[PDB]
Paper text:
In humans, the CALHM family encompasses six paralogs, some of which function as non-selective channels that are permeable to large substances such as ATP. We identified the three paralogs, CALHM2, 4 and 6, to be highly expressed in this organ. The CALHM subunits thus constitute unique modular building blocks that assemble with different stoichiometries into large membrane channels. In contrast to previously described CALHM structures, where the oligomeric state of individual channels was described as uniform, our data show heterogeneous populations with CALHM4 and CALHM6 assembling as decameric and undecameric channels with similar abundance and CALHM2 as predominantly undecameric proteins with a smaller population of dodecamers. Despite the unknown activating stimuli, our study has provided insight into gating transitions of CALHM channels by showing two conformations with either a cylindrical pore of uniform large dimeter within the membrane that is constricted at the intracellular side as in case of CALHM4 and a conical pore that continuously narrows from its extracellular entry towards the cytoplasm as in case of CALHM6.
The smaller particles are composed of decameric and the larger of undecameric assemblies, both of which we refer to as CALHM4 channels. Due to the slightly higher quality of the Ca2+-free sample, we continued to use this data for our further analysis unless specifically indicated. The cryo-EM density of the decamers extends to a resolution of 4.1 Å and undecamers to 3.7 Å, which in both cases permitted the unambiguous interpretation by an atomic model. Both assemblies contain pairs of CALHM4 channels of the same size related by two-fold symmetry that interact via their cytoplasmic parts. In the plane of the membrane, the dimensions of decameric and undecameric CALHM4 channels amount to 110 Å and 120 Å respectively. The diameter at both entrances of the pore measures about 52 Å and 60 Å for decameric and undecameric assemblies respectively, thus defining the properties of an unusually large channel, which could be permeable to molecular substrates. In our data, we find strong evidence for a layered distribution of density inside the pore within the presumed membrane region in non-symmetrized maps and after application of symmetry. This density is observed with similar properties in decameric and undecameric proteins in both datasets of CALHM4 obtained in either absence or presence of Ca2+.
Numbering used by the authors:
A (entry chain D), B (entry chain C), C (entry chain B), D (entry chain A), E (entry chain E), F (entry chain F), ...: 4 to 83, 94 to 280
Write the structure that this text describes.
């Protein structure tokens, strides 16, 4: 009964996607909490924030594609009629499974806002501030590059610092919501177009998916068993008894040519 | 006996709806407690409050529609007599299941009132207040935009601040109740009209719903088994034995054309 | 033996009603403790108290009616001799089950008294108080509207405040008892009239109720099984084997017209 | 063996009565501890104490009568020889079960004495007290109405207050004992008269009570089963198979008139 | 059922790789936390940081290759047509398993950044610093070599120290991301080329891998059993009974030449 | 099933080696923590550090060789063609098992560095230090010999002390890494040469190892049983019954010569 | 299965030796911690340290020899060809088991060093110390005899005391290592010579040891059973029934001579 509910969960797309999203959230939380500190330099703040913001998204997307064995088969079909559309639909389902990780990472990282502040702490528009008039441009880049990591300046500076930080957090969370909404809308219209383009009815589709899963599992079982039987026959020929046999009555001593023979697997 | 009560709960619309509502409430509580802070800017306070207030409602509604497989089938029927009314009724039941999430999120978020204060902290009507007479309009937008996040001004300011906050909380909770009542009334009249328009009697309807559930489960079971049998026959033809067979007496070595053959699934 | 006592409790009207009442009490306690604060405005105090006092009662009553499936059947009978009286009696039992929630909520909320103080904190009769003579009417509405939420005024004000609060709590609890007594008396006379009007004897009534419960459960079981058998025959016709069969000897490959055929359920 | 001792307790009148009394005591304790505060007004103190003292007694008595199904049957007999006396005896046993709740509530509430002090804190006889000579009658009602809730006056006032409180507690507990004794004596003489008037011997009575319990349970079992059999026959006629049957060989498709037919239950 | 899921995990490449990565991370954390301290010398800081950075990577890579028994067989094939490509593919899978450890160690050690600071604390570009103008070159190497381990100098020195440390941490984490991205991209293009060059189809490949695993396990089982049977026959010849036999009736005392005989195993 | 996984672990070389390494690490940690203190003499510091560093390595190596029973058999073969190479390979496997302990002890003791500081605290190169110019050579050996155990001198001395200690820890850990790398490289090239020199194929080798293990276990079982049977026959001859027999009917009293006879075991 | 692994451990020489060593270590630790205090006399310090150092070693060695029953048999053989060498080998194995205790006790006691300091605290070479020049020889023995137990003298004395204590601890631990190395080397060369001198091959030896163990256990079982049978026959003769018999039909009353007879056991 345990394996019953195990497979029943395995089929559930919702459970697998929720697990992927929860794992991404937790991993991102730990990762940010431990290994994130702003450089607080002048030219290198941007790249530092954008790397954490973007790179793991690409990594996780490429992982979500490459870790699906079915993707390799469909690529082999493409790599050097109806079948084209069916391949497109399988690749579509693969994309649906894979895309959940980069977008959840991006959404949680933007909603938290910590990365964005560091990423765009130099682009702050400072035109109506009383302390920044006299300061030289280079000195301006220096004072502007210090705000996110820490505060050591007088109270007026920490005031303007907190105001800029609040503005940038707002911008970050707004980007997060724009991305969430755009992604859900795109996924909806994409499922709509996929259903519209499908040459199958609503019943043939279920038979199709079941056929795919059963076909893969059955061919792997059969191939493994047939190979084992052939190997067991090669060994019975060489030694003179079947490996599983009990109380074998005839044993054949191998010669010096038989070893040479069984060296090669005949593919 | 466990799966007995599991399916018995699965049928219960009341239990599923209560679970959806409890999960939405808890998720909203955590979400608000962790990632909510007002920008306390001048033009950007509104959008920030309205995003949290509205966007997750749209997200959850689109989710409640799209996650129901039956909706995809009915759309396929619509996508390029009595059947039209039956499709309308199924889509109606789907809507009934889906609508519970956005309205519970909206009701709990309005009753709590925290989002509304930030959302409409600029529109405060300040005409009979003694400190706001002399202040310039821009300075007025600046002092008005600071009240929700924190208080650093003298005691008179914190007094007027607390009064405005109480007024806005009142308005929020009133909107919450208006929405709850309007939604329940609309749901009631909608179920009434649906029952009135139904061409079925009170008994044919039960037979209908049972037929729908049984039809879907049975066709998926049958299709999966038939596909497995056909695949098991293709493998018996290629290898020479049935994958489940024990003590197979005849094994056929595949040729170089058979692999080419079994490459294609014949759809 | 577990399901034995489970159904035995399910039949018990007393247990179900006690559970409904306990759940309403607990929910009201939590709800009031968390999301209740007085606006302490001038015109908006009343509506705020009356909403919490009244709206959930209407909500819970409409819920207690609409969540009973039998009510839908009786409405369908009414919706576009002896049977009329029997329908009246069933609807009466439904009302008996449903009414327990709004009245328990109202009784507990009035006995607690917290809502009533806020609801009617403006209507206080202030004619024999020494501080309210000179105060202007608008200023009077302002001082009167502040008493429930908090006290910041001198000791004389907190004295008169506590006195008004005690008077209003008294009025609230008295209303609570009047409502409890009126409701119990009405329920008693209503059960009396229902028994008096019943055209059945004391024995035919038991047979009647048992007939109703058995009729509903049996027709749902039978209809579900018959639909499953018909579906299993349609699938045997299409595929060539019965879904439950083991070691099927004849498999029929479907054609391109059979899929079209089984697309429609024949209702 | 569990249901054995469960029914054995169910028969025990002593256990059921002890449970009712313990539940009433605990409920009264919680109720008084949470929702009881004196108004400390002038004209409204009395009604406030008398409501808590009396109303729940009436409520619980009407509940103890109305919750007994047998009472409904006997009323139906009365509602529009030996049988009259037997009905009187059944109604007598019902009264014996019902009366335990109001009298236990009254006894515990009077023995505690908290309600009585508030109920009769205005009627105090103040004729030999040195501070009450000069005070005007209205001022006297004001000072007299403040004693129970709290003490803020000088030490002489708190002295006379504590003395009045002790006197009223004494009166309350004395009333409690008078009520307990009167109730037990009345119950004793009432059981005596009931035994004296009973036209049955000491053995016919046991057979009678057993007959009543067995008659009710048996008729409900039989009626339910007979109704189920008749319903199962109506369904066999409509569908063509009995709902419990396994491997049904003949299935009859219903026509459009059969649904109309089975719509009505034939009562 | 335990060994079922044990082997099912054993097959999972993802689980084994995740376990290797987690173990490497934990071991690196402990190792760095306990046995890492900078020498804070002048010429020897570099080698000290580069050893920890690089050497364990080489060690773990050579371990990941050498601990795979299959690698020894393929090397024996190489050591003094289609088979060459198949050997290349097996060696490729071995590389895929092995490479996960050195790159995870390098990535975690660079992302942490502690090693890099010590490794390149001498190469700091000091051209625009006010305290380093006058200092002699040798004294410069001395002050520059002290920053990572500890701070004892005045506040200006600890300021410039913290700035250099932040710059070097930035450079380290950037190198970490460059390495992660380059490694994932190389692995992707490498799997692509391997799939492109594979002379097998998508089905022959599964049969191939299953054949390899079954062939190895079966030949080891068979060889062990055959050797045991031959040994049991040599012992039956020498002693006169089979080691497992019960109630042996004939025992042969060995002579002084038989011991000489059984001394040699005949290979 | 327990003994199943017990033997399966017993075969695992990796598990046994990991256990040996963990035990060596823990034992070394305890040993160093409890019984290690520097003498802080002048001529005797070196020997004291080198003993702990080196002696347990020799001890553990000789133990790893001598505790393997197979080593005794191969030595007996050597002690006063193909067989020589096979003996070399067995001795090689023994060495592979044995070498893991001394090198792990050496690596952990060097990486920790505590022993090395004491071992080479006299050889410190003191040529560019301001306090050591004037001090006489003997006094120099005295001040130099005190640094590791404790510090009682002024702050300048503890400064130079900490610097020397850091330098020596660096040298120790560098030696540790050099030893680890040299050992792994030597083990790799040694396994390579052993595989290259092996006159067996990749399959004959598995049969060989299995033959060795089975041969040893079987001959010990057979020899023990045969000896027991012969002894049981000597006792049956002397006493007149077989030791395991039940309900022996004939008992023979031994004479005074039989005891003399059974005194000798006939070897 | 429990006795299976119990005997399997019993055979393991390594487990028994490890247990002996652990028990000796723990016992020595407790013994030293509780009952060890230096006399701090002049002539009696030496004997006190040497007793604890040496005597328990002799005790434990004599115990390890005398507690082995096989040693008694071999001594009986010696006490008033090939057999001499076989006896030598058995006595050798006994020595191997016995020697582990005295050497572990000596090694742990020397490595700890506490005993040695007390044992040789008088022999300290005091020739280059400034306080010991003037002191008279007897006074020198008095000051020298006080250092180990406690310190009450000025700081210069505690300095020279700690230095002497460190020197003596060094000497102790060096002796410990010399003893460990000498013992392991002697054991190795001794096992080598024993294997070299053994007239048996590598297989006859296993048969020999198994024969010895089986011979001892079997003769004890047989002798016990035969004696029990003879005793049971003497009792059957005297009483007239066999002690284990059930429902004995014939009972013989003993006479006054039979008691005299059964008094003697006939040896």
């Amino acid at each position: 009964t345990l394996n019953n509910i195990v497979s029943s969960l395995q089929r559930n797309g919702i459970f697998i996607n929720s697990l992927i999203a929860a794992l991404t959230i937790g991993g991102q939380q730990l990762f940010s909490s431990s290994t994130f500190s702003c450089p607080c330099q002048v030219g290198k703040n941007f790249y530092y924030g954008s790397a954490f913001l973007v790179i793991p998204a690409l990594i996780l997307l490429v992982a979500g594609f490459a870790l699906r064995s079915q993707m390799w088969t469909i690529t082999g079909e493409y790599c050097c009629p109806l079948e084209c559309k069916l391949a497109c639909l399988r690749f579509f389902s693969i994309t649906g499974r894979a895309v959940i990780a980069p977008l959840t990472w991006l959404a949680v990282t933007l909603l938290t806002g910590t990365y964005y502040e560091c990423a765009a702490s130099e682009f702050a528009s400072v035109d109506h501030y009383p302390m920044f008039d006299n300061v030289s441009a280079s000195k301006r880049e220096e004072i502007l590059a210090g705000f996110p990591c820490c505060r050591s300046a007088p109270s007026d500076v920490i005031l303007v610092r907190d105001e800029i930080a609040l503005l940038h957090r707002y911008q970050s969370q707004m980007l997060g919501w724009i991305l969430i909404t755009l992604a859900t809308i795109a996924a909806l219209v994409s499922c709509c177009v996929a259903k519209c383009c499908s040459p199958l009815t609503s019943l043939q589709h279920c038979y199709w998916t079941s056929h795919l899963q059963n076909e893969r599992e059955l061919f792997e079982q059969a191939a493994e068993q047939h190979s084992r039987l052939l190997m067991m026959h090669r060994i019975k020929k060489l030694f003179g008894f079947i490996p599983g046999s009990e109380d074998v009555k005839h044993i054949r001593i191998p010669s010096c040519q038989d070893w040479k023979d069984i060296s090669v697997p005949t593919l």
